[PDB]
Structure 1
Amino acid sequence: SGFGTSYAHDPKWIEDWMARKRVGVDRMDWFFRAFNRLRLYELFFKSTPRFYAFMVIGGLLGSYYWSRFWEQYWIRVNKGRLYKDVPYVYPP
């Protein structure tokens, strides 16, 4: 309360919010365990030359397929309105 004055103070709900520290709780650990079973750290990240190779090779293949995906997205949104989708009929 006291919003907009020199008496402004945190409301009770903001104070209750900050009383929930969630100490000891870890609800997203499952994701890290599962990611660690991919062995990306032991195989690529740990060694600098291999980390560089992951960024390069992963950026080569990622860039190509990202383009591929968004090309298909475009071909679908604009179906029937693209030059390839409407062969031209020559006048007689």
Structure 2
Amino acid sequence: SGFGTSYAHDPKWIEDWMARKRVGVDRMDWFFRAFNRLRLYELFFKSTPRFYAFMVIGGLLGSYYWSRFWEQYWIRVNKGRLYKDVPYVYPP
């Protein structure tokens, strides 16, 4: 309360919010536990030359299939309005 004055102070519900520290709670540990089983760190990240290769080879493959995915998205959205979708009929 006191919003907009020199008496402004945090309301009660903000104080309660900051009283919830979630000490000793980890609801996302499953994600990291399962991610670690991919062994990406042991195989690629730990060694600098392999870390570079991951960025290069990943960027190569990632860039190609990223382009491929959105090209299909474009073709679906503009279905029936593309030059390839409407073969031209020559006048007689």
TM-score (norm 2): 1.00
Q: Report the alpha carbon displacement of residue 38 of structure 1 after superposing the two structures with TM.
A: 0.1
Partner Cα separation in structure 2 for residue 90 and residue 61 of structure 1: 42
Residues 34-80 of structure 1 deviation map (CA, whole Å, 9 limit, x = unaligned) = 00000000000000000000000000000000000000000000000
Q: Distance in 1 between matches of 2:31 and 2:75?
A: 35
Q: Which runs of 5+ in 1 are unaligned?
A: none
1:2, CA displacement in angstroms? Answer: 0.1
Tell me how far apart the structure 2 counterparts of residues 83 and 29 of structure 1 sit (CA, whole Å).
50
Give the deviation of 1:4 after TM superposition.
0.1
- The answer for the alignment partner of 2:36 in structure 1 is 36
CA distance, structure 2, for counterparts of residue 44 and residue 14 of structure 1:
44
Aligned residues with identical type, % of pairs: 100
CA RMSD of aligned residues (A): 0.1
TM-score calculated relative to the size of structure 1: 1.00
Provide, for residues 8-43 of structure 1, a one-character-per-residue CA deviation record: whole Å limited to 9, x for no partner: 000000000000000000000000000000000000
Q: Distance in 2 between matches of 1:10 and 1:67?
A: 49
Alignment size in residue pairs: 92
Tell me which stretches of 4 or more aligned residues in structure 1 moved more than 4 Å. Answer: none
